Symmetry: C2
Subunit: 604 residues, 2 copies
């Protein structure tokens, strides 16, 4: 029974006939394994039966491997050929919610694809406790939003009506009031109130437990399963940061476009629309960033893709890092900053002015860009994988695909299946490490981003199950362990996540400015109250600006001793911002030190 | 030739005679190795000749090892028996400065003691580049101290003479002027000026390079050489923090003693004297902390000392951490804080007041406590090791000790030598990890603390060479690698050092308050000058206090809007303190990420 099938005319022909000769123990050439004699050199099962015959295909070149032989063009394809159950209890409609038979991914696909499919299946249950603490925040961020006087002053037009602010832009830009920030700041109080600073502190607890409990999990998965130089790297990173700023400026021009033609408030309709339009070009500029990441690595020194696990990963992911997240690193740490003396922008070192944010925290503009990137990439990378097959279950496959595991010699049909690609699950880990660096990078806001990534991870655990089972020409059942190049990147994201979640709460969410006013401006030092009460916070926080209106900034009022230089309060909150950065990092980095000390990695 | 020598009466006698029987292939019993037959079970040289016969002594107990046999009392001692050169070119006066033959510590003592003696020898050259950048600071902290107007106002009695401060203590405590802080603040400007915030940033660069270049070094050393549970651990840490605060209060009462009987200013003579008196009791309370660390581990569960490498290390070092450093963690983060409304102390939750620091930064009280702890422990732990032998080279040893390597059967003389102790180089790594967590914990101040620890590490590299060669009964040449339990502790000190050096500069050194005044109070916002100049900083920084005098604090003057609550400036500097914590950690933790990425660990 079959294990692997292969498929200037006479000049390449003599290059081909000599390799098949010592392999011996259109028309497609069968193999079958002499089977034992290469099973002792490396340390039955049809998934293993394709392994050893690929190990046979590894050593013997020619006299004058299919690495350069298929890349030259002599061969057109070389490919291989339990499956019935993986369409029923693990694939689609006949049943879709049943626990994943991960040891029956060893049975078919091994651990190249299993260590993604248990890292996905662990991720989903680890997103389950992370989504109820999104629903918990959705409970007391919305249902508790009837008294909290953050999003009650802003929607009462008596506390939030007469608050006449300044324009942001220069021309065609109004003196816009408050009471136009209510439909955004009635749902803003579910994203920030108290159970996000519980939740992001929980997320920092979560991601540093998501790691370590997976570190115990993959150890259990390791248990149940087997076991000129500084000049060349310079001009690869140096053209890169020149192309980072293209991606940072990609959103902003498409921020310069849609905001003109426009003007369920239109402000939510626009922030959806620009995060659709920027989602178009980040879908486009993703294609270029794969092609300019290949041509920099082949212009880099020789190693087959096998070294691109260390080099294309650190370039193509890190392009995707810049392509996806450095737009969101704009709406978060660089958008809302740099207003000055006459509302002085930094003018962005050119002839135009720079742009500002709104007085609710600029987190809502993030949290919809966060939503419909990670929930648009969830759609678009699970609609692209039902459009490649150009149908969803055309043929019946009721008694036929049982037979395709029975015997059913069909390799003319398996030639029609698309090849897996030269890089395997590199493109599939990429769209999840992109998702994982969305659930943990910008999560203070939108705590249901686990739930959105939960029902995604009930489908993506099943749609990637389905296209591996039905659609793709079968990948070689390679045995790897420790998923590899992403685990320093996940920890590289997670240590960056403890910084950036804390920088989300401090520098792009006005909850520390709320925390402080509760504790240090409604006490009678600088305040007018008896005990702690959040009454009167929206007038009590911002800076007036004489016509020589308020703007989202902590600055001395004009007509005071040192005006448009900061306050005690810009100084206190930025000192409490920087303390919250300092405290919550030194606690989460201690709990990361404690929890990894509290439980050993190897299985109990 | 000899490899290892051993040495109710009849009741213990029958327990003894049966072990020697199958070992066969006062009066001291020789051994010599049947030598080959245990050299294949584990994977010539007299240093190895004592290894394999100790490996022979490992398996065969008795029928009814010297672990429990010498601990019971049947045996009185069991011990073992190239050496001429290690007294000449590596030991003392005949020659003392010659490069250490570290591979000739493999020749005699192996890698139990060699991996300390190359970790010391690397440490010394890595303290050499760290001491010139102490001399560089000693150049432009002293020789540049003629204009800097920090320590020129304080010694000019015209800028620092009329500055009439407040008392610190309550009774017998004066209204003390300035011009009594000049002899301390003429040498204060060598400890803090610019080339300490270069140097501590250099130290944070240094310790994160001291690690990684040793990580490359020990890899080269690995290359050239071989290859109820939560309830029991609770009440060990819970009685401990009750004994931490004894060590914190150990200094303060001996701060309450000497400061009464007293009152080259007497203030330098007192800070030497109390850091002599606290050095007495920390020498005393060290003895208790060894005895209460043993009796907690034998009251903990059974493992011979072999598990005490993981448990006595994490208790006895961590006692020494608390015994030595938590006095210096008092003079640094908890001494100079908590002054309040009528100069309100926190009263230390009792019937007495609390105590304050001086207006130069409280770093000088640290830097002499830092000096004469680490330079008194350098004396006392290298005078205790010339007093145990009760002489230094009594006998001639010119042609005799050459003969002790020639043959010279002398085991009656080697019985007189003191035993090495049950724990080996645990007490010798301890006094250096104590020194290493002095060079890197509290180093912003005293940049010659590498040079003090350099000439120490020319003697300690030689006095520990000498007592290993002449004095001690020879340790068993055990082969270990990665020095072990201290390498997570060194990295545990070093990641704590990046925090605490930055917390030295910010929270216990007024250089950030100098940095800020240079940049943000002598510009005309809040200032009265044309360009940046450090003129007028000592009046311009502190808080007046109506009789209702200045004190080292950033507070609103009485008779202002919200008095004795902080300023823009307490708010700016503490925001720039916390930023300097944030920036220099995120740069040093990035350079730690960059340098460990820049160079691979395994040898080139
Ligand atoms: Ca997929
Ligand atoms: Ca010593």
């Amino acid at each position: 029974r079959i294990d692997f099938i292969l498929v200037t005319n006479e000049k390449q022909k003599r290059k081909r006939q000599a390799y098949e000769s010592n392999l011996i123990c259109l028309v497609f050439v069968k193999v079958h394994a002499v089977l034992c004699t290469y099973a002792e050199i490396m340390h039955f099962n049809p998934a293993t039966r394709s392994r050893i015959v690929y190990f046979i295909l590894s050593r013997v070149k020619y006299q004058v491997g299919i690495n350069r032989l298929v890349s030259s063009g002599i061969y057109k394809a070389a490919f291989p050929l339990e499956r019935y159950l993986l369409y029923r209890e693990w694939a689609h409609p006949r049943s879709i919610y049943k626990k994943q038979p991960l040891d029956l991914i060893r049975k078919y696909y091994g651990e190249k694809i299993g260590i993604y499919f248990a890292w996905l299946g662990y991720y989903t249950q680890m997103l389950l406790l992370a989504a109820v603490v999104g629903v918990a925040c959705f409970l007391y961020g919305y249902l508790d939003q009837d008294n909290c006087t953050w999003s009650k002053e802003v929607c009462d037009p008596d506390i939030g009506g007469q608050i006449l602010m300044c324009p942001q832009c220069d021309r065609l830009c109004p003196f816009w009031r408050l009471n136009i920030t209510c439909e955004s700041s009635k749902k803003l109080c579910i994203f920030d109130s108290f159970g996000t600073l519980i939740f992001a502190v929980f997320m920092g607890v979560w991601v540093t437990l998501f790691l370590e409990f997976w570190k115990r999990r993959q150890a259990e998965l390791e248990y149940e399963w087997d076991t000129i130089r500084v000049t060349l790297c310079a001009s690869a990173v140096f053209f890169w940061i020149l192309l980072i700023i293209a991606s940072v400026i990609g959103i902003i021009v498409y921020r310069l476009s849609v905001f003109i033609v426009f003007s369920l408030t239109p402000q939510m309709a626009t922030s959806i629309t620009a995060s659709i339009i920027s989602f178009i070009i980040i879908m486009i500029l993703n294609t270029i960033y794969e092609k300019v990441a290949i041509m920099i690595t082949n212009f880099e020194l020789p190693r087959t893709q096998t070294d691109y696990e260390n080099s294309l990963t650190m370039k193509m992911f890190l392009f995707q890092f810049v392509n996806y997240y450095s737009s969101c690193f704009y709406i978060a740490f660089f958008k809302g900053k740099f207003v000055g003396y006459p509302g002085d922008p930094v003018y962005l070192l050119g002839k135009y002015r720079s742009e500002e944010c709104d007085p609710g925290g600029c987190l809502l503009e993030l949290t919809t860009q966060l939503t419909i990137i990670m929930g648009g990439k969830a759609i678009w990378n699970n609609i692209q994988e039902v459009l490649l097959p150009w149908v969803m279950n055309l043929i019946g496959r009721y008694k036929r695909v049982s037979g395709s595991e029975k015997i059913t010699p069909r390799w003319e049909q398996d030639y029609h299946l698309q090849p897996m690609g030269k890089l395997g699950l590199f493109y599939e880990y990429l769209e999840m490490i992109i998702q994982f660096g969305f659930v943990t990078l910008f999560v203070a806001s939108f705590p249901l981003a686990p739930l959105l990534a939960l029902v995604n991870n009930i489908l993506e655990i099943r749609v990637d199950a389905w296209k591996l089972t039905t659609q793709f020409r079968r990948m070689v059942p390679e045995k790897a362990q420790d998923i590899g190049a992403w685990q320093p990147i996940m920890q590289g994201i997670a240590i960056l996540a403890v910084v950036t979640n804390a920088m989300i709460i401090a520098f792009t969410s006005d909850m520390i400015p709320r925390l402080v006013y509760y504790w240090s401006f409604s006490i009678p030092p600088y305040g007018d109250h008896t005990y702690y009460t959040m009454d009167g916070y929206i007038n009590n926080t911002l800076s007036v600006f004489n016509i020589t209106c308020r703007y989202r900034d902590f600055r001395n009022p004009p007509g005071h001793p040192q005006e448009y230089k900061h306050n005690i309060y810009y100084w206190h909150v930025i000192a409490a911002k920087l303390a919250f950065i300092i405290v919550m990092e030194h606690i989460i980095y201690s709990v990361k030190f404690f929890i990894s000390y509290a439980i050993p990695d190897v299985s109990k």
